[PDB]
Subunit: 222 residues, 3 copies
């Protein structure tokens, strides 16, 4: 029953400790499947490992993380309250806190995913960053790309899903909508707030912006 | 004191186990009020139940959830780190992870609320979806509606709050602002990135989009 | 080892209880550094205190919070799953749930930060509110300001970071992009969805909006 399975958790935690994993609290750790690990792995409180998971050397997992059927490279840092399912992280990635990686999430070396970011069937290239308030679905994102806060892939049209491709060295300004299918060429810049409905050339700016105007002495409702 | 109340928690957890609830860890469960439940209910670690809560049959509650004064229908799945207060879920709803339902949140049968979604005094209809990065306040949303990632109800003008009504079979494109009060007719489509300031007719597209343009050889600051 | 350090945690929790702090579960509390507190402080389950932290009187900390090197004024309420690092809260602030305050976050008296909000090197003035789905970086925000859902400071141009200044009594409509450096004068109103690329005068409306239009009988892909 509940109590018996809980005892089995204690057993796994003890064995992990003996195998050289640093568990901050063995009473607040759960493994529901199998865990392979390198050396100097640190796991904080209330972490749940599900399915078949492998961790490299020096991986640090912060409080409250849920990691299911995932492969985590050496030196990765997973910050608090991050949920990871069927994902692969290369070496030296940093994700979270409050990141949500869904199946097909693939991060290349040194990639960063910040708070309130969701990834599904999406690859984030080497040294690339998606720091805030972003949804990346059905997307290929190249190396050295900056995905600005509020960026969203419009991948689903109510019927089908379509693919977004972003080249290397692209800057995606904040609050950009990438309307799939679309391709953004290497070195391109998307202006903040752009709705990208057409492919963008290499080294080109894409923009869809009304010039700002001002009305004086404008009074809000009382 | 602290320790005495903690003992009372152990008691409630034990009684829940005896009554047929599956608690993954009775030592990491809190009930501060009253819990009614059906059969085959599963509650993961670090769940807190507050006030008066009722759960149907086969409800699954993932790690770290906080559920206060709420009614949860049969077969609902509440994913990790979801906060629910004074809400009602019909049968077969799926919410979270990282969903925040505030008082007046009402989900009809089979509704879905995803990550980084907040609902307050808002009804989400049958089979309707709000999957990502969305705020729905003071809103009626019909059946079979797709609420795209980044959608926001602009409900508060600094003085008062106003109501948004969205009909059945509406597609709301990503990053739409619904400027209340506003009504979107059944079958309508809102283009991604639209600022909806006027009512939308049945079976109509609403759009407010600058055509994309491109400037070649555009160099970002060094 | 793990077990020894865990014993030291039990010790600190016991001492906190004896010093008049209400810990909901002393077995689910962690202090990694030093904690100073006033009277009637309440700390819920799975809270982690890191570095050197000071709390005023009547501070309430909800489940799962992580508070590092921060100063929390009297009567503050920190809601569940909120991460706070190198921040200062004045009296009577309310933050979270799912708020993420990074170093340099400074909240003045009675300020509110809601769910899925991130702050970094940003000051939020007296009685000011950032309730939802927002990133505020490198920003000064005055008193009695409403920061609408979906607001983002565009602070980083790929090379450098720039400062946003928002005056007192400003209403920032939902989904506004503040393109730094920029200054918004006292009493100004930013329309929902505006991309603010130019300074805004006192008591002025700033807007960058395509008028909504409609196409009848528009059929989505099958
Ligand atoms: C200071 O930061 C910016 C300035 C700026 O603008 C100052 C523009 S812009 O998009 O308006 N823009 C631009 C883009 C890249 C580099 C420099 C400027 C731009 C585009 C076209 C025109 N005509 C003017 C500015 C964008 C940003 N920053 C972001 O979008 C942040 C992304 C993130 O969250 O990491
Ligand atoms: C591929 O996905 C889209 C394509 C598209 O566009 C391809 C438009 S659109 O809005 O630009 N658009 C449209 C809308 C619905 C169905 C098909 C197209 C549209 C509207 C007007 C015009 N003239 C062209 C396209 C929107 C989306 N998707 C979303 O908005 C995702 C919502 C979510 O997160 O679930
Ligand atoms: C009902 O709420 C609104 C109405 C409205 O609009 C009704 C506009 S508006 O921006 O379109 N607008 C406006 C702004 C402030 C007060 C009243 C109206 C506005 C601006 C210019 C013009 N011409 C018309 C309306 C904005 C809001 N609300 C928000 O943006 C919510 C912010 C939040 O999340 O707290």
């Amino acid at each position: 029953a509940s109590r018996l399975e809980r005892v089995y958790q204690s057993e796994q935690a003890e064995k992990l400790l003996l195998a050289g994993v640093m568990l901050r609290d063995p009473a607040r750790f759960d493994l529901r499947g199998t865990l392979t690990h390198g050396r100097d792995v640190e796991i904080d409180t209330n972490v749940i490992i599900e399915g078949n998971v492998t961790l490299g050397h020096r991986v640090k997992i912060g409080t409250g993380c849920v990691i299911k059927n995932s492969v985590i490279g050496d030196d990765c840092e997973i910050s608090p309250y991050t949920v990871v399912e069927d994902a692969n992280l290369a070496a030296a990635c940093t994700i979270g806190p409050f990141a949500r990686l869904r199946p097909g999430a693939e991060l290349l070396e040194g990639a960063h995913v910040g708070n309130f970011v969701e990834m599904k069937k999406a690859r984030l290239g080497k040294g690339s960053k998606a720091g805030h308030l972003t949804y990346l679905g059905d997307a290929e994102i190249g190396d050295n790309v900056n995905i600005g806060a509020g960026t969203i892939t419009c991948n689903y049209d109510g019927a089908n899903k379509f693919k977004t491709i972003i080249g290397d060295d692209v800057f995606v300004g904040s609050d950009t909508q990438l309307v799939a299918p679309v391709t953004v060429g290497k070195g391109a810049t998307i202006a903040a707030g752009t709705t990208v409905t057409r492919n963008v050339g290499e080294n080109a700016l894409a923009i869809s912006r009304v010039p700002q105007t001002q009305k004086e002495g404008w009074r809000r409702p009382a």
